[PDB]
Design a protein around this ligand. Sequence first.
Ligand code: U52
Ligand code: U52
Ligand code: U52
Ligand code: U52
Ligand code: U52
Ligand code: U52
Ligand code: U52
Ligand code: U52
Lengths: 122, 122, 122, 122, 122, 122, 122, 122
Amino acid sequence: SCIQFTRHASDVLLNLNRLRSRDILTDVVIVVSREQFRAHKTVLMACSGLFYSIFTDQLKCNLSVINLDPEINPEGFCILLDFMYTSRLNLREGNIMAVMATAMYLQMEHVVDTCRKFIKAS
Amino acid sequence: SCIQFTRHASDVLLNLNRLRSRDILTDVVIVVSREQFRAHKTVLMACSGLFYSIFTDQLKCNLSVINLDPEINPEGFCILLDFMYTSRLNLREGNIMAVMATAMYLQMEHVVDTCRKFIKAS
Amino acid sequence: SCIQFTRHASDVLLNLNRLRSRDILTDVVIVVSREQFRAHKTVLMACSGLFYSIFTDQLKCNLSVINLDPEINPEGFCILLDFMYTSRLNLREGNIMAVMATAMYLQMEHVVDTCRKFIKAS
Amino acid sequence: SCIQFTRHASDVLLNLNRLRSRDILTDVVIVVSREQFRAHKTVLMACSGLFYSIFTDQLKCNLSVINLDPEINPEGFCILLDFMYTSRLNLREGNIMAVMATAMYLQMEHVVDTCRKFIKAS
Amino acid sequence: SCIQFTRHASDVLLNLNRLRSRDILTDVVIVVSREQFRAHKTVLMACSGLFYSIFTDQLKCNLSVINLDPEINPEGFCILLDFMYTSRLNLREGNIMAVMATAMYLQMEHVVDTCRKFIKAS
Amino acid sequence: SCIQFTRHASDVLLNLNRLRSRDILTDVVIVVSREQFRAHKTVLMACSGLFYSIFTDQLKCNLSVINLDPEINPEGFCILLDFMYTSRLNLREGNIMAVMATAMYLQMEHVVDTCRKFIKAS
Amino acid sequence: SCIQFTRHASDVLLNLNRLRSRDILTDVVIVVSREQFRAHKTVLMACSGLFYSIFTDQLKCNLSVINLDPEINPEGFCILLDFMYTSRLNLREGNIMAVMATAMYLQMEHVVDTCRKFIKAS
Amino acid sequence: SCIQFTRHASDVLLNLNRLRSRDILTDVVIVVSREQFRAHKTVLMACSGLFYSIFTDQLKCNLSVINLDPEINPEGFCILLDFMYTSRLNLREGNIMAVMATAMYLQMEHVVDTCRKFIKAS
Ligand SMILES: CNC(=O)COc1cc2cc(Nc3nc(N4C[C@H](C)C[C@H](C)C4)ncc3Cl)ccc2n(C)c1=O
Ligand SMILES: CNC(=O)COc1cc2cc(Nc3nc(N4C[C@H](C)C[C@H](C)C4)ncc3Cl)ccc2n(C)c1=O
Ligand SMILES: CNC(=O)COc1cc2cc(Nc3nc(N4C[C@H](C)C[C@H](C)C4)ncc3Cl)ccc2n(C)c1=O
Ligand SMILES: CNC(=O)COc1cc2cc(Nc3nc(N4C[C@H](C)C[C@H](C)C4)ncc3Cl)ccc2n(C)c1=O
Ligand SMILES: CNC(=O)COc1cc2cc(Nc3nc(N4C[C@H](C)C[C@H](C)C4)ncc3Cl)ccc2n(C)c1=O
Ligand SMILES: CNC(=O)COc1cc2cc(Nc3nc(N4C[C@H](C)C[C@H](C)C4)ncc3Cl)ccc2n(C)c1=O
Ligand SMILES: CNC(=O)COc1cc2cc(Nc3nc(N4C[C@H](C)C[C@H](C)C4)ncc3Cl)ccc2n(C)c1=O
Ligand SMILES: CNC(=O)COc1cc2cc(Nc3nc(N4C[C@H](C)C[C@H](C)C4)ncc3Cl)ccc2n(C)c1=O
C-alpha cells in the first residue's frame, strides 16, 4: 500500500526544536511568574489541552502574550516545554510534584499518569 | 536516565494534522498553479528544505502567501503535504514522476531517494 | 463479463478526503461541544446511520449546521470522521471507550463491534 | 498499530450508489445531448479529472447544471457513471470506442488504459 | 431451427436497471417504513410472487403507491430490489436474516432457498 | 462477494411475456398499418432504440397509442416483438428482409447485424 | 405419390400461438383459481383429453367459460398451455410435481410419462 | 433446457382433422360456387393469409358464412383444405393450375412456390 517512516516524526520534532532554539517563527510568549518562554502555538496545542482550548478560541488565537497564573511552578513548565519538543521528560524526586501539578494545569493526561507511576514505583 | 516515548512523535504529528484539517493557526497559503493549500510554516520547514531556506530568511518569514512556480505538479505537492503531516506517502505508478520531481523542487532528499527505489523495484 | 477495479473505491475515498482537507464542496458543519467539523453530507450518510436517518429526512436534508448533543466526546467523533474518509481507525486504550460510545450514538455497528473485539483481545 | 478494513470502501461506495438511486443529496445535473443524469459532485470529482478541474474552480463549484458538449456519447457517459459508483465497467465490443473516447474527455486515465488493453487483447 | 441469444436476457435486465436508475417509466412507489423505492411494476411481478398476487388483481393494478408492512426490514428489501434488476444478491452474515425474512414475505422461494444454503454452509 | 443467478434474467423475461399474453399492465398500443399490438413500454425501451428515444421524451412518455409508419412490415414487427420478450428470433429466408428493415427502423443494431450474418451464411 | 412438409405443422402451431397472443378468435376462458386464460377450443381438444371429453359433449361445446377445480395449480396449467401451443415444456425441479399432477388432471398421458422420466433421471 | 416433441404438431393436426371430419366446433362455412365446406377459423388463419386478413378484422371475425368469389375452382380449394389439415398436397398435372391459382387467391406463398417447382420439374 504505502511506506511508513518510523523516524520521520522524531526528525520533525527535532527540527521544530532547532527553530525554537533559534527563535524562528516563535509567535507566542508564555509568561510564568517572572519568566518568559517563546514557543510555537501549534506545538503547544499539539501537546497541551489547555493551550488547545485557548488557541482554539478565535478570541485567543492571535494572542501574542499568554499570561499564566503566577502560581504555576516555572520548573514544571520549562521541563514540560522541553519534553513537548523533545519527548524526553526530566522527572526527578526534587521536581516530580511541580511537574505533576503543572501537567494537571496544562491538561497533559499522559504526563500526569506517568508522574503517578513515578511515585508509585519510587 | 530518562524515559523514551516511542509513540509521542506520532501523536504530535496526528494532532498537528487535526489542527490543519480544522484550519487552526494555519498561517500560510501555498499557491500552486490555481490551487491553494493552507499549512503551518513550522511543519513545512521541518519537512522541506526549500521552505526551510525560504522561512529561514527574515525577509520571507512573515510572508502569508507563498507562490510556487506554476510548473510544479499539484498532485506531487498535495501528496507530499499529506505525507508531511501523516508520514504516509501515496506513491503509485501514475504519480511517481510528479512526486519525484516535486520532492526535488521541495528538497526532500529522502523522498526522492524513495522514488528512486520505487521505480528501481517496479 | 466485466472488469473489477479492486483499488477504485480506495482512490475515490482518497480524493474525497483531499477535497475535505481543502474544504471543497463541504456543505455541512458538525458542531460537537465547542468544536466545528466541516464534512460532506453524502459521506456522512454513507458511513453513519444517524446521519443517514437525519439527512434522509427532507426536513433536515438542507440543514447547513448539525448540532450534536454536547455529551458526545470530540475525540470519538474526530477519530471516527477521519476513519470515515480513510478507513483507518486510531483505536487505543486511552480513547477506545469514547470511540465505542460515539459509534453507538452515530450507529456505526461495525465500529462498535470492533471496539468490542478490541477490549476482548486486550 | 491500527486495523485495516478491506471491505469498508466497497460498502461506502455501495451506500453512495443507494443514495444516488434514491436521489438523496444529488446536487448536480449532468446534461449530455438530450439526457439528464443526477449525481453527487464529490463522487464525480473523486473519479473524474475533468469534473475535478471544474468543481475545483470556485466559479463552477456551485453550478447545479453542468452542460457537457453534445458530442459526448451518452452510452460512454452512463456506463462510466455506473462504473464510478460500482467499480464495474460494462465494456463490450459494441461500446468500447464510445467509452474510451468519453474516458478521454472525462480524463479517466486508468479507464482509457483499460480500453487500450481491451482492444489489444480482443 | 432458430438462434439462441445467451446474453440477451442479461442485456435486457441491464437496460431495465438503467431506466430505473434514471427514473424512466417507474410507475410505482414502494413505501417501506420511512423509505421510498421507485420501481417498475412488471419487474416486480416478474421477480416477486407477492407483487404478482397484488398487481394481478385488477383492484391493485393501477395502485401508484404500495405501502408494505412497517415490519419489513429495508435492508432486506433494497438488497432484494437490486438483485431483482441485477441478479446479484449481496448476502452477508450481517443481513442474511433480514433478507431471508423479506424474501419469505415477498415470496421469493429461490432466494429463501439460497439463504437456507448460506447459513447451512457458513 | 455475491452470488450470480445465471437464469434469473430469463425467468424475468418469461414472466413478463406471461403478463403480456394476459394483457396485464400493458400500457401501450402499437399501431402498425391495420394491426394493433399491446406491449409494455419498459420492455420496448429496453430492447428498442427508437422506442427508447420516443419514451425518453417526456412529451411522448404518456402516449397510450404509438402510430408507426404504415410502411413498416407487420411480420418484421411481430417477429421482433416476440423476440424482445422471448430472445428467440424466427428468422427465415421468407421474412429475413422485412425483419432486417424493421430492425433498422426500430434501431436494433444486434438484430440487423444478425440479419447481415444470416444472408452472409445462406 | 405426394410431398411431405416436415415443418408445416410447426408453422401452423406457431401461427396459432400468434393468434392466441393477439386474442384472435380465442373463444374460451379457462378459470383456474383466480387466474383467467384465453385459448382456442380446438387446440385444447387437440392436446388435452379432459378438454376433449368436455368439448365433445354438445352440452359443453358452446361454453364460453370453463371453471376448473380451484385445486389445480396455475403454474402447472400455464406451463402446459404454453407447451400445447409451442411444444416446449418448461419442466424444472421446482414445478415438476405441479405439472405432473395437472397433466394427470388434463389427461396428457405423454406429459405425465415425461414427468415420470424426469424425476427418474434426476 | 427443455424437451422437444418432434411429432407433437403432427398429432395436433391429426386430431384437428378428426374434429373437422366429425363436425366438432366447426364454426365457419366456406361457400365456393355451389359447394359448402365447414372448417375451423383458427386453422384457416394459421394456413391462409386471405383468411388471416379476413378473420383478423373484427368486422369479419364472427362471420359464420364466408362467400368466396364463384370464380375460385372448388378442386383447388378442397385439395388445399385437406392439405391445410393434413400437410399432404394432392398435386397432379390435371389440377396443378387450379391449385396454383387458388393458392394465389388464398395467399399460400409456399404452396404457389411448390406449384412453380412442380411444372418446372415436369
Ligand atoms: C504525552 N502527551 C500528553 O500527555 C498529551 O495528552 C493530551 C494531549 C492533548 C492535545 C490537545 N491538542 C489538540 N487537540 C485536538 N483535539 C481535541 C481532542 C480532545 C480530541 C481530538 C480529536 C482533537 N486537536 C488539535 C490539537 Cl493541537 C488537546 C488536549 C490534549 N489533552 C487533554 C491531553 O491529555
Ligand atoms: C523524509 N524526510 C525528508 O525527506 C526530509 O529531508 C530533508 C529535510 C529537511 C528539513 C529542513 N528543515 C529544517 N532544517 C534545519 N536545519 C538545516 C539543515 C541543513 C541542517 C540542520 C542542522 C538544521 N533546521 C530547521 C528546519 Cl525546520 C531543511 C532541509 C531538509 N532537507 C534538505 C531534506 O532533505
Ligand atoms: C465500517 N462501517 C460501519 O460500521 C457502518 O455500518 C453502518 C452503516 C450505515 C450506513 C448508512 N447509510 C446509508 N444507508 C442506506 N440504507 C439504509 C440501510 C439500513 C439499508 C440500505 C439498504 C439503505 N442508504 C444510504 C446510506 Cl448513505 C445507514 C446506516 C448504517 N448503519 C446503521 C451501520 O451500522
Ligand atoms: C479507475 N480510476 C480512474 O481511471 C481515475 O483516474 C483519475 C482520477 C482523477 C481524480 C481526480 N479527482 C481529484 N483529484 C484530486 N487531486 C488532483 C490530482 C491530479 C492529484 C491529487 C494529489 C489531488 N483531488 C481531489 C479529487 Cl476529487 C482528478 C483527476 C483524475 N485523473 C486525471 C485520473 O486519471
Ligand atoms: C430467483 N427468483 C426467485 O426466487 C423468484 O421465484 C418466484 C418467482 C415468482 C414470480 C411471479 N411472477 C409472475 N408469476 C406468474 N405466474 C404465476 C406462477 C405461480 C406460475 C406461472 C405459470 C404464472 N406470471 C407472471 C408473473 Cl410476473 C410470481 C410468483 C413467484 N414466486 C412465488 C417465486 O417463488
Ligand atoms: C439484441 N438486442 C439489440 O439488438 C438491442 O440493441 C440496442 C438496444 C437499445 C436499447 C435502448 N434502450 C435503452 N437505452 C438506454 N440508454 C441509451 C443508450 C444509447 C446507452 C445507455 C447507456 C442508456 N437506457 C435505457 C433504455 Cl430502456 C436504446 C437503444 C438501443 N439500441 C440503439 C440498440 O441497438
Ligand atoms: C404430447 N401430447 C400428449 O401428451 C397428449 O396426449 C393425449 C392427447 C389427447 C387428445 C385428445 N383430443 C382429441 N381426441 C380425439 N379422439 C379421442 C381419442 C381417444 C382417440 C382418437 C381416435 C379420437 N379426437 C379429437 C381430439 Cl381434439 C383427447 C385425449 C388425449 N389424451 C387422452 C392424451 O393422452
Ligand atoms: C405451407 N404453408 C403456406 O404456404 C402458408 O404460408 C403463409 C401462411 C400465412 C399464414 C397466415 N396466418 C396468420 N398470420 C399471422 N401473422 C401475419 C403474418 C404476415 C406475420 C406473422 C408475424 C403474424 N398471425 C396469425 C395467423 Cl393465423 C397469414 C398469412 C400467410 N401467408 C401470407 C402465407 O404465405
